[model samples]
Target: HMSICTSEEWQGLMQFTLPVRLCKEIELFHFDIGPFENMWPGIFVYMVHRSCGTSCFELEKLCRFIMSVKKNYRRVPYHNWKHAVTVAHCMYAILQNNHTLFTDLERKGLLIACLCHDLDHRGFSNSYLQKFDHPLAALYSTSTMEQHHFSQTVSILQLEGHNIFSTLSSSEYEQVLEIIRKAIIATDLALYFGNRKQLEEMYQTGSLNLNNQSHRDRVIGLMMTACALCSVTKLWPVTKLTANDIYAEFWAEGDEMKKLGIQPIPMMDRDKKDEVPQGQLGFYNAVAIPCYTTLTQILPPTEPLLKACRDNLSQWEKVIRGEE
Candidate 1:
């Protein structure tokens, strides 16, 4: 029988110290980063330090941006400071491993993007945006919700209260803006999943450019970010906690939609008794794991961590099934 404590146990197994000032700064900048016991931000800082050697000033700007938006827009639901922190942490990890491919500027830009990528999210998926004829869909005009998110995020940052990056040199700022734009736009699950499949196929064909350091690095960076977002099944406790949080939020949102006479999201509607956790479990197994495993093979260091995920899943399954 697998223990239910795999996630907590694994978290305890990894330990490091962060600069108290930086830690405090992240919490102060984004209250959401703290209320969760600094859960996601702690992981973000830890991953950044482990992979990138140091954290940068822009990281705080990003955190503050997320916190600001989350505080102001309670209806945006799960797209909160914690989600930003989690994605940023995942992006940092991916970038660190593929450092040789990215210049310092590109890396910093990507980090900024990850941090502010979803600022001003409106608690609706791309489908909702299209269905409702949201202004963002028109403002973006071409890239659908990806463009909408990027535009909204930048718009918020440009606002009087949220323009934290307005002080940077125009050239430097533009570079950061480019990175932010690219990173945020890449968060579309459709794009992410498609890219993952392509990468997996490349691996199967043994066509990966392990030798073309630049291409390998770029592909790895993108894949890592994608994996991190969809990585609930990758880490024991992180995956479990992420799933629980998502499920709870889904139900809550579904209930709200019911009251308002709006259709709830497919998997999230509390009224849909037919929607089983098994569907999410299947997604973790069929989609997330294969993609992660393929990428881990390309980047060997992630293997042990991924193995822990496998162990954690088996443990979770046992607990869910009342097995001992």
Candidate 2:
């Protein structure tokens, strides 16, 4: 896999830090992208220091871990380092508010999960892997790619000079590992729909108990989904770029599947490209809007996300109607 041309933009990134206050505006879809995308690691590091505090992590080890993470991501069209950073950045901005539901350790764990959610993604999806009987498909009966991602994250964590969680005692270290594992696995969309339904029920029935570990884990799982798909909440141009990259990856996989004599899904098949405008509308109505609507009601700080999703919904409608 070739690398992105902007790889050099990240040189010496780990050595510097962005202003900690720079985090406030980062929740927006378009913030600072024109200025300094290269320093994402700096912002990521500073966000960790601010949220998890220095006591939960070693600065040097954390930097090494993030750099290694960056190196591990394939230069896939969409699920690359930039996507991972964007997802983590979304989570960081979300965590900036009064998310007291998560403890300090869990906060660190969530950010780590975001950064590692798609580590070393190979451009194709789990369906593509299983269709070809790829090694990863044989490894996990379900969520094949997600399992690989979590394993890769753990591999880096166990590497020399990479275990930022070394500050944690035995129990907390293991707990963080579990948090990362669940959060990474939950990024699989197959798991999200039902989880979203259950999340809403929990809130409505007044059973959304934070003290219970399972409830908290469920909340964490939904957060993972929101952050992973937060591209829907971005600016039009920003979301457009990411959306194109997403289909680029999808169409590439569909091309491969075609060669293998398998028919790709409508969304994946480039032949169905004409239907993409309608597809975006369907996706937003079925997934993004519902997710954001629920997310906003639960986390008021995320109201902008719902608003953006609605705005983007109309943009996609305009795309369908040629109203732009």
Q: Give the number of the best model, judged by TM-score.
A: 2
Task: Report model 1's TM-score to 2 decimal places.
Answer: 0.68
lDDT of 2 by residue, 27-103 (tens): 45445343566677787887787787755666667777888888889889999988888888788877876457568
lDDT of each: 0.57, 0.82
Question: What local lDDT does model 2 show for residue 298?
Answer: 71
TM-score of each: 0.68, 0.92
Clashing pairs in 1: 7-237
lDDT of 1 by residue, 1-324 (tens): 101213333244234355566454432211223234445534554545544445444444434444444443334445666676656655665565566756666666666567666655656666556656778777665457667556666766765434556766899788667766766666665666666666667777888776675444446445535544544534455555666666666677566667767877678776664454555556657655665676677776455445655665576566557662
Residue pairs in candidate 2 whose N, alpha carbon or C atoms collide under 3 angstroms: none
Model 1 lDDT on a 0 to 1 scale: 0.57
